[PDB]
Amino acid sequence: GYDLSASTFSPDGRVFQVEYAMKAVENSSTAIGIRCKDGVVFGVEKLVLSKLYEEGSNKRLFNVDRHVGMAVAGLLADARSLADIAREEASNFRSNFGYNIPLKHLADRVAMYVHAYTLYSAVRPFGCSFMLGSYSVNDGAQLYMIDPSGVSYGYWGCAIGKARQAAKTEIEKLQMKEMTCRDIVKEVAKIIYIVHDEVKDKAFELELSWVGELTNGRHEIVPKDIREEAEKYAKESLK
Amino acid sequence: SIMSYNGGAVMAMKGKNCVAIAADRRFGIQAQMVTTDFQKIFPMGDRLYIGLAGLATDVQTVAQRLKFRLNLYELKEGRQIKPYTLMSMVANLLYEKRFGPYYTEPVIAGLDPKTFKPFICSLDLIGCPMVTDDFVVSGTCAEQMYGMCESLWEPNMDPDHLFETISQAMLNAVDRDAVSGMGVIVHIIEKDKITTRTLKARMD
Amino acid sequence: SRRYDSRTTIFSPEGRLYQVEYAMEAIGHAGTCLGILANDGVLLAAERRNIHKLLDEVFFSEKIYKLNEDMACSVAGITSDANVLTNELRLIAQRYLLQYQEPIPCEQLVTALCDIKQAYTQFGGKRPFGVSLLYIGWDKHYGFQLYQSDPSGNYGGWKATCIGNNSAAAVSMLKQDYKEGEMTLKSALALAIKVLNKTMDVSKLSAEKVEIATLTRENGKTVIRVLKQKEVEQLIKKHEEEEAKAE
Amino acid sequence: NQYDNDVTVWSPQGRIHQIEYAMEAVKQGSATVGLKSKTHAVLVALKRAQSELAAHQKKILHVDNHIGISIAGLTADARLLCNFMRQECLDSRFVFDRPLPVSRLVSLIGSKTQIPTQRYGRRPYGVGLLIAGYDDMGPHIFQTCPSANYFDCRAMSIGARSQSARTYLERHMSEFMECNLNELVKHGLRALRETLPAEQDLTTKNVSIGIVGKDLEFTIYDDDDVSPFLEGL
Amino acid sequence: RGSSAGFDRHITIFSPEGRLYQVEYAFKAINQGGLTSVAVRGKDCAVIVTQKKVPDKLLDSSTVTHLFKITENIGCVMTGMTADSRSQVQRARYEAANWKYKYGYEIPVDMLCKRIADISQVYTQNAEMRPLGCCMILIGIDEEQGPQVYKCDPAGYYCGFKATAAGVKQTESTSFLEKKVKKKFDWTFEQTVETAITCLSTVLSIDFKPSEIEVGVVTVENPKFRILTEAEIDAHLVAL
Amino acid sequence: SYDRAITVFSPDGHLFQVEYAQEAVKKGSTAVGVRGRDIVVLGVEKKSVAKLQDERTVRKICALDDNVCMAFAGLTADARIVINRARVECQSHRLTVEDPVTVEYITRYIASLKQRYTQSNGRRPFGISALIVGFDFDGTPRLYQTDPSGTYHAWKANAIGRGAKSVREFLEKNYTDEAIETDDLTIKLVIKALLEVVQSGGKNIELAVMRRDQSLKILNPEEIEKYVAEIE
Amino acid sequence: DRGVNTFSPEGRLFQVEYAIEAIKLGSTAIGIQTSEGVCLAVEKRITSPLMEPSSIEKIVEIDAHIGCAMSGLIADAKTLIDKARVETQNHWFTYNETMTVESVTQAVSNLALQFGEEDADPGAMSRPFGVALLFGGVDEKGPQLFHMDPSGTFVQCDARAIGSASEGAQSSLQEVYHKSMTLKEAIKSSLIILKQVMEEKLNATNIELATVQPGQNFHMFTKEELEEVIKDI
Amino acid sequence: RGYSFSLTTFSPSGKLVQIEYALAAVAGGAPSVGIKAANGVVLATEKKQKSILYDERSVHKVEPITKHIGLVYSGMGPDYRVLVHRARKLAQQYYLVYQEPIPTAQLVQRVASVMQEYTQSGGVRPFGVSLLICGWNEGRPYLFQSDPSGAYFAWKATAMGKNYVNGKTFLEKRYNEDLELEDAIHTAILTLKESFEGQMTEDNIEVGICNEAGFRRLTPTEVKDYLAA
């Protein structure tokens, strides 16, 4: 009975309620994010369950500040909760220090909020991983990813979701360090379609959002003129 | 001046191996007396008395708050209190309500319960302790009995000289104060006995 | 968390409080403590437990803990929980004196501790105090009194009672050699040593294994006086010899 | 066995049974149907026969003058959730003097509904809501679940046997955005009728209709008011 | 051997042999990261050396670190659960700044390990919370006492060390490195870095690259905590 | 603050802690109250006298006010909390109404307090029942009974405690207008009901009678043997 | 083993599911709404002959125009029917109008499901209420009658029986009720159905009857008034 | 949010088993010996570190509370320190009120009242620490033991830790009531020798004495002088 609480280690030193909560992320569809020379491009394989949902429901790409975006994967109600936490931390930073929050600090303030629910029996861990991404002129492009345990690492590319391992091999053969943001979007859409299973989970709507030098460091959804010119590019190499 | 509402005058004097404490007996309103038997000297030990002047509601309250804390002390510590330690107990009690103070300036007078070393002390209304070896005064006629005890006090007095000194310094002070008087009670605290004499005073 | 909780303040399906009844058995293996009411006083006769050779003699008693100018107690059970209770009775005894300028009547002091003890058996989810404890005292309204207070929070006034180990055998001996309205103090000291022989399994008494306190009135002032070692050794020898003159 | 009593306990499959059991509470309530055109947003609900003598329920609630909800699940958790929604719509008109947008109300629900799904000794809100609205962005059919995420729907039905309605709605959703008002409501009535036993039909006594529109505040329609809508079905 | 009765398995209450069965599992949680940290103090220096396993090619290796800067003069290395690691670092950084605000001088390594261990004791005595599955090793230069290497653990025990290891190969690298606390002083100068690296190199059998470890130093000539660059580590790794 | 639901429902709709608090009432000493025309008589059954009680302070008939007095059965320590909180409410009611309480008012206060610990967090129910007797300002005698559930009823005669299933079967066949006529014959109706339950017999009961103004007085031990000899 | 706020796998929220089974042990109460008034009739269930039956107050005044009928755990009702009485007086204080029968039922049923054991209040309900309540009165909409199951589900009924014999008296209410019967014919119909379902012999001591007319206020029948009705049955 | 229920409850035999199990934590700890002489109290414990790498001059097991009260433990290291910093705080809260150094009995009554509270408060285990507390007040030496229940006992001499029952029998032979302090330090060291398992040096133990000059623990230069005899 070593797995009913987050305030309980296993006899081999594991907190299973944390490790069960990251099975919930592994049951969610794959969201990837690639840090390049000009910025960060997110991409979510958003599984649309019913035909009755409007195109844009259950949105997985969040704006947590005007320069920071958030791609989530996992239990979506927990993800919208942490998006509000990351918005409050980015708000309180500007109200106390007067400038846009660095992505290093914002990722660490939110990961220590996630970590705070891995310690007690009064709460459960969050059932979501989520990537953060921003661009500054001074700080450059940055991509951090926070696990349900509360650990935050910087990435050149992260691939949370079901096809986590299969998407990491596609990001690893990409050489993102020299490529620009309009070239990464054509590649993120390739990686999303190649890891999507056209047998198990049927319908899916691609969601793409960058933040980079071409937006003067603003995070926004990729426009449909550039989005459709990458979905057409992705199907042409899917053969 | 709110401590002149009820009046009052308490004085404690040190002798050789004995102390004396004395107070007036008048309870009053701004100029009106009600009783001539008001207690202002309270037995805080076997041979250790506190004397309180000032506002008469605080003369009664602080003596009851101190009897509260001292009986807790004497049960828990299993011994009688030393007169220096009662001084710090009163100084904590008066300072704990500093903003909005107890309007009393108490004097304590007693003997060390294992040395018989004489001890007199005086405190301000917010608990600033004054240990002297000559005399301590407190009350409405402070200046009357500062200068009265600056002349009559001699070092190393016998208990009979100490009674004739503190009683000639109380009588000549409260007969020069309007709101103090109606009698003087004197306690001579020695090692073998406590002698208590009320004495003939002017009843005006 | 509901898993880790033990539910200390619930009822048994027979209508019992387990943690109270389990605290009652902590006392039946504690030091034997008895109290006898006389016409001029009440006594306490606690069998001393800490009787090791290398113990010092610091503070006045081992299990008496005088509460007031006019009343003292005596505890048996958890030693540590008794110290928390006896600080609390001294606060209640001095809050009555602060509020009324009269000493606390002895039934009103026992009632107020028994409300604190009952409150840990009904709400809060804590364990009860595993301390049953006797009370001797004087007051204006009924004079000399003797009380007992179980961990349940109920109390009773007694003429002779006993708590601790072998209390049931000690009570039955107090049912027969106690006479109501006829016990002097010196007759009750001899009854205390008589009970502390057939309820202590050792061969005899030595006065390092007992502690006796008497409460009397002397010129309008209650005196509470723990008997010294020679005062009890004379009472042991007055019973160790008189038992030879009865067989 | 031991993973279903608490909401702070994940199962070994990355799954919270106490949340999924509260979603079972809304799949065994009563069928309610919500749908929208390019002009209106219609909530149709079955006022369920508790007995043969009960004025059945009320299952469509006024929230604002531009937002109304429909209830599936525990009715006392619903109006506890609706009194939050009514206060949150009065909060905006007191502060901003404008109608609170429909997508922002449901985002306040899902952040208020997520909080008991993560703390010990608290249960999920065992209620599903279909939310009709008319913001400045048009009509809206937000569905919310006890698993506190929410769904912007073109049309949606929740409750007992509501998959038969979603079977109906997903067939005729291709023509909802070019309907009249009376045509759009009748699609919701034919969807609501699909959730009925074969011995039962849509009377005027067991059907409520809630409509919100451009030049129309949110209105519920009682027993005598659903008779112009049932006149073609 | 070890008895158990009740909820000794789940909350920090006592075993029937009085063991705190739950606190002993947080020490197993330190080995879960798979890493080993070595700390050693010289005569004018104190060095921390830990493994740097960037297992993914896509990690930004500038962020994969276990060395942390608590104050300008106190450095840290962490071993264990990486999220519990970062929480104790922020609590150490916070407790070290209240010292400067309340007392006006820089906190010793003496009293920063003592305060962090007093926090960790509260986790071992309250049932509502687990211990942190991580251990902190702090280094620094005191004014009178010189170089200090102090390690606190999940139990709340914070003793001082001439040389410490932590993590997986902790026993293999304490039994090794206690043999170099033999005849004089483990070469107590700036090449106690070489003592720290060859200790970690032996128990791992790795013979590290320039960027497979990370080294943190303090000195008396430089009391500020510095993280060595990979060009500075390869100046030491090529010397052995 | 210990906030945990102690009294919860069970299958078949039972509150176990309320049912188990009523088993604590049935393990207590038997209390009997009957209601006459201008007299109310409470009597409790002392199980053991032991010749060492100071019996003044284990009396189970208390006095809530000058016009209201109650007798309990069950956990004696739980009663003393209920007796004292009823005495505070009887004084607050003189403060705000300028009238003594009615007997049904303090019965509602005791019952709603007993209901409150069956439904509040972190509390067990009171393990007592309470036979409350009194007189109105009109002079009508009253007799009430509260349960640990918080339910209260008025009674012509009632019995709580151990053996109360047999004492109430006795009183339902012997309570008439003729036995409730004389004030002394009403007192022997409690003593006849108690002696069916006292398994040792004799003068080992306690009994208190309250008539109108010139109020409540508990009867002495030799004043109770005068009635027991008049029923021998 | 499980908390009070725990859903069944069927989504039923266990403690409420068991508080409904507590009502089936309480005595039978009948309400009938006619157009000329409502009537509330309850079995008293006399346990002992020594019990004075004037203290079994299973019908209470809420206001002058609303009376309530209870069944189940009568002690649990006294906190609900006191919150009912204070809410009508707070409505009269603020608005100088009598509160409607629906909104008193709506306010009381908001207290159902307001229980819990995780900081719900410093003093909060540990458990749901083990009562069903039949509110009945005359408002500006006329005579109305409401039911108040412990789930907080409140419903307007034309005729509703609650208690130990409800399933069987609700079968008798559906046969004899019609939408134009008189209050005299409803008082008489509420006693033939109490005759079928009571265990003891039905007299004017073991029943309790009260009506609310549009003209007169709430009133409860006396001993002399009930004797006329029982002879008619 | 913190558990509000007692983790220590009564067993059906009438025992508080979490206290009885915290005594087992004490009886597994390092041996600590206290001896009250006629002019001083000596507190000695086994300060035996696990390896050579541990700095012996870093942490201390004999800790001063005031200038005149020191104490030592057997049991758990970290539970001692939360209890020894509150003891230092209770000693100064007395001194702010009374301006007198706290009596040794009064400090032990305040420390043990804390230790009682974590046997009854919600969501906490007891301390796994016994305390030998020494002090010099009113010309008299004092030695107290504070058990994990919260019970205190004044001892002429006693011992805790591993082999405490064997060690306390050794105290009952070699304890004179009229010893001096310098003759009690040797008999305290010999009790730590009756179960040591090794060769004890100036760094393997820790000695603290309390005479009328106050409390101080002995320097390791001073420990070596007493080990020569």
Please tell me about this protein's structure.
- The structure is cut from a larger assembly and holds 8 protein chains of 8 kinds.
- Chain A has 239 residues and is of the alpha+beta class.
- Chain A has one domain: Glutamine Phosphoribosylpyrophosphate, subunit 1, domain 1, CATH 3.60.20.
- Helices cover 35% and strands 25% of the residues of chain A.
- Chain A has 7 helices and 10 strands.
- In chain A, a hairpin with a 5-residue loop joins β6 and β7.
- Chain B has one domain: Glutamine Phosphoribosylpyrophosphate, subunit 1, domain 1 (4-Layer Sandwich), CATH 3.60.20.10.
- Helix content of chain B is 30%, strand content 28%.
- Chain B is an alpha+beta fold.
- In chain B, the strands form 3 sheets. In chain B, strands 10-1-2-11-12 form a 5-stranded antiparallel beta sheet, with helices on one face. A 5-stranded antiparallel beta sheet of chain B has the order 5-6-7-8-9. A two-stranded antiparallel sheet of chain B has the order 3-4.
- The longest helix of chain B is centred in the N-terminal third of the chain and has 21 residues.
- Chain C is built from 6 helices and 9 strands, in the order αβββααββββααββα.
- A 5-stranded antiparallel beta sheet of chain C has the order 7-1-2-8-9. In chain C, strands 3-4-5-6 form a 4-stranded antiparallel beta sheet.
- In chain C, β5 and β6 form a beta hairpin.
- The longest helix of chain C is centred in the middle third of the chain and has 22 residues.
- In chain C, 53% of the residues are buried.
- Chain H has one domain: Glutamine Phosphoribosylpyrophosphate, subunit 1, domain 1, CATH 3.60.20.
- In chain H, β6 and β7 form a beta hairpin.
- In chain H, α2 crosses α3 and α4 packs antiparallel against α5.
- The interface between C and F is large, with 43 and 36 residues.
- β6 of chain C pairs antiparallel with β3 of chain F.
- Chain A: It holds the Pfam family Proteasome.
- Chain A: It is found in: Cytoplasm; Nucleus.
- Chain A: InterPro entries: Ntn_hydrolases_N, Proteasome_alpha, Proteasome_alpha-type, Proteasome_asu_N, Proteasome_sua/b.
- Chain A: It comes from Homo sapiens (Human).
- Chain A: Belongs to the peptidase T1A family.
Instruction: Report strand % of chain B.
Output: 25-35%
Give the end-to-end Cα distance of chain B, rounded to a whole number of Å.
22 Å
In CATH, what is the class of chain B? Alpha Beta
Q: Architecture of chain B, according to CATH?
A: 4-Layer Sandwich
Short description:
This is part of a larger assembly, with eight protein chains of eight kinds. Chain C is α+β, with helices and mostly antiparallel strands and 247 residues long.
Break the fold down into its secondary structure elements and pairings.
This is part of a larger assembly, with eight protein chains of eight kinds.
Chain B (H helix, E strand, L loop, with lengths): L8 E6 L4 E6 L2 E3 L2 E4 L5 E3 L4 E4 L4 H21 L6 H14 L10 E5 L6 E6 L5 E4 L2 E5 L2 H11 L6 H16 L9 E6 L4 E6 L5
Chain D lengths: L16 H10 L5 E5 L3 E7 L7 E2 L4 E3 L4 E7 L1 H21 L6 H12 L13 E9 L2 E7 L5 E4 L1 E4 L4 H10 L8 H13 L13 E7 L5 E3 L12
Antiparallel strand pairs in D: 1-2, 1-9, 2-10, 4-5, 5-6, 6-7, 7-8, 10-11
Helix pairs in contact in D: 4-5
Chain G lengths: L13 H10 L5 E6 L2 E7 L7 E2 L6 E3 L4 E7 L1 H22 L5 H8 L22 E9 L2 E7 L5 E4 L1 E4 L3 H11 L6 H15 L9 E6 L5 E3 L2 H10 L1
Antiparallel strand pairs in G: 1-2, 1-9, 2-10, 4-5, 5-6, 6-7, 7-8, 10-11
Helix pairs in contact in G: 2-3, 4-5
